[PDB]
Amino acid sequence: TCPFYKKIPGTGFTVDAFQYGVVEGCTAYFLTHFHSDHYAGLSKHFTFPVYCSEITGNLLKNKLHVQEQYIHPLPLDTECIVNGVKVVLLDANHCPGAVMILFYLPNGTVILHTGDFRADPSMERSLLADQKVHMLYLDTTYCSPEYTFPSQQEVIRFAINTAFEAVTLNPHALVVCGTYSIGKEKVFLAIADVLGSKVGMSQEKYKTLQCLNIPEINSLITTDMCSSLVHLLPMMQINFKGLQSHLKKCGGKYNQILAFRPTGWTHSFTRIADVIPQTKGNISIYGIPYSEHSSYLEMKRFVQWLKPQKIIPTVNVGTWKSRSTMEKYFREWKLEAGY
Ligand SMILES: C[C@H](Cc1nc(NCc2ccco2)nc2ccc(Cl)cc12)C(=O)NO
Ligand SMILES: C[C@H](Cc1nc(NCc2ccco2)nc2ccc(Cl)cc12)C(=O)NO
Numbered sequence: 001t002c003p004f005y006k007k008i009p010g011t012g013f014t015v016d017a018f019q020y021g022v023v024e025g026c027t028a029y030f031l032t033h034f035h036s037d038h039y040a041g042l043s044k045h046f047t048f049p050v051y052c053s054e055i056t057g058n059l060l061k062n063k064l065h066v067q068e069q070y071i072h073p074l075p076l077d078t079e080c081i082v083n084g085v086k087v088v089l090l091d092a093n094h095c096p097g098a099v100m101i102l103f104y105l106p107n108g109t110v111i112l113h114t115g116d117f118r119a120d121p122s123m124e125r126s127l128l129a130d131q132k133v134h135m136l137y138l139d140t141t142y143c144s145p146e147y148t149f150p151s152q153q154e155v156i157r158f159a160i161n162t163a164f165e166a167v168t169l170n171p172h173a174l175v176v177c178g179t180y181s182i183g184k185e186k187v188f189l190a191i192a193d194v195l196g197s198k199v200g201m202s203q204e205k206y207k208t209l210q211c212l213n214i215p216e217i218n219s220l221i222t223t224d225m226c227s228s229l230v231h232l233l234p235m236m237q238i239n240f241k242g243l244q245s246h247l248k249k250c251g252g253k254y255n256q257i258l259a260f261r262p263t264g265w266t267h268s269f270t271r272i273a274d275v276i277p278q279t280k281g282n283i284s285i286y287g288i289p290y291s292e293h294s295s296y297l298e299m300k301r302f303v304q305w306l307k308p309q310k311i312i313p314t315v316n317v318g319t320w321k322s323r324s325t326m327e328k329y330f331r332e333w334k335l336e337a338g339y
């Protein structure tokens with residue numbers, strides 16, 4: 001059964017609702033981005049129109065093998081008409097191809113669905129500007145004040161400096177980055193750039209990256225592993241056992257592994273410059289707080305600027321405590337800002 005926060009009232013639209021079979025009355029299924037908690041259910045057998053970004057559409061076609069006739073890519077920042085309703089897709093500053101969706105309902109109501117997003121002041125100068133929003137479907141992943149993490153730029157600075165120093169001190173070190181979903185590509189791309197290397201990865205991950213419209217991607221990535229000194233591995237292999245196993249593979253070409261795990265928020269107190277790795281012998285593992293979701297302060301600033309009349313959270317909605325906590329913050333933001 002489809003939850004209410006995945007339905008757009010007054011329309012036949014759903015958002016990120018693919019695991020509920022045929023949704024009654026749904027004439028168009030929107031997919032905000034290609035993350036498994038959002039596309040769950042989509043396959044080559046789906047026979048309804050899917051609306052999404054071009055990049056999401058590339059991934060649906062190539063990775064899930066959804067039939068081309070059902071994939072409806074839309075350009076960003078462009079007023080489009082879907083089933084008689086004006087819609088706009090906006091960059092969500094999440095992962096590649098991730099969008100927010102503006103729905104202009106026939107009765108005059110305007111709904112913004114953020115999908116997953118990392119709120120940024122640059123969004124205050126999109127089609128959102130001076131646009132009255134009556135309903136906001138908000139990515140509330142980190143809607144609590146203890147959720148602080150650095151900017152992505154600060155985290156990348158730390159990663160680049162850490163890797164460059166280690167490989168300059170030891171030209172025989174290998175850098176490993178953990179990955180599962182799309183997103184956070186800047187971690188491995190920026191490290192490989194400072195090391196003058198391409199990023200080596202499996203065929204499956206290479207295929208995924210080829211769908212992302214990344215400029216000059218063929219100059220940056222490869223499936224030739226031992227010709228690269230930055231390797232991608234599944235996130236579950238980023239441990240001492242899995243990295244010890246990987247060090248054998250390259251045939252004694254490397255004698256040290258520096259690995260990066262680009263987590264979300266963790267309870268770690270410490271500043272970005274003072275992050276230290278887990279080390280066992282010649283293997284060190286850095287957990288870096290590279291987030292593609294809003295910090296609390298980023299979320300608060302975005303909502304207080306947008307001044308929506310009603311907020312519908314789309315994350316952390318499963319407990320009375322979580323729902324009550326988020327509503328208390330929404331009220332605090334509204335009282336402080338005056339809307
Ligand atoms: C990598 C996967 C996907 C995943 N699952 C969950 N929990 C839900 C869950 C666990 C098992 C099935 O469904 N939370 C995640 C949080 C961040 C990220 Cl990146 C991925 C997450 C995983 O961890 N388990 O399958
Ligand atoms: C890439 C993530 C994948 C993901 N993240 C989350 N929480 C947000 C979170 C925690 C740590 C990093 O990011 N929860 C999931 C639960 C189930 C599954 Cl399968 C995937 C999940 C995303 O942005 N997905 O949209």
Ligand SMILES: [Zn+2]
Nearest residue numbers: 033035094116
């Ligand atoms: Zn996501």
Ligand SMILES: [Zn+2]
Nearest residue numbers: 035037038116
């Ligand atoms: Zn998500």
